[PDB]
Amino acid sequence: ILGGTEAEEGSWPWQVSLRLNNAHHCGGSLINNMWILTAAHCFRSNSNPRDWIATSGISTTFPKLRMRVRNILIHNNYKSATHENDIALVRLENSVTFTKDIHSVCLPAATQNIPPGSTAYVTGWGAQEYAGHTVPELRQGQVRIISNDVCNAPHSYNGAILSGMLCAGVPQGGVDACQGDAGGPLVQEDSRRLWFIVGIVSWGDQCGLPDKPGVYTRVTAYLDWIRQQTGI
Amino acid sequence: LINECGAGPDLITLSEQR
Secondary structure, three states: OEOOEEOOOOOOOOEEEEEEOOEEEEEEEEOOOOEEEEOHHHHOOOOOHHHEEEEEOOEOOOOOEEEEEEEEEEOOOOEHHHOEOOOEEEEEOOOOOOOOOOOOOEOOOOOOOOOOOOEEEEEEOOOOOOOOOOOOEOEEEEEEEEOHHHHOOOOOOOOOOOOOEEEEEOOOOOOEOOOOOOOOEEEEEOOOOEEEEEEEEEEOOOOOOOOOOEEEEEHHHHHHHHHHHHOO | OOOOOOEOHHHHHHHHOO
16 A cells, blocks of 8 residues: 555454465455455466465454465456456355454445545555555555546556446555555445445556556446355 | 444444443
């Protein structure tokens, strides 16, 4: 996360770290007591459940809970060349005991309204500037949804943002997800104080460039896939 | 919280209050 702050314990109870060969690699979100929603490209080099561990807690050095992984499911039509359908599910070896500090985020409704300029929070242990290292302490940053068409401007991504994707950032830049934040959530609170995952951190041109906002998997576009795989 | 979803800390503490 660029331009954000350290999250407090319990702020983001669905956030998890995914560790490959005992190092933080990607973020994810609990969507029930067995399942974590994340990005496909996290598993491009290794998709062996035995080599992955999930953790909960604001700290990756001193986690509150370590959880073994049993299954990794990559979207059937994930295409790395165009970043399309960059989405994955991870099923845990044992159910997680839900508490105030550790529990699930809501999936959005198929008709969820997500206006441009609307506020959202992105969370993770990613780098604090382009080319930096990951951090041990969870960070959060506040950003605004940017319309797909504006994001597709010739001076921006110029047609690369597709319908199952979404963009977010701030006009002057400096606030964004970075390398190490992939698979983490982009969340909005509704007026009943429930939080919904609208995006999954996916890709972008560097990090924090004003003309290049963060690109995220649009979760509404994958609801039917998720329900099939998980019953959620 | 429980097998429900989306609850921040303030929502949980509220629901605990009698």
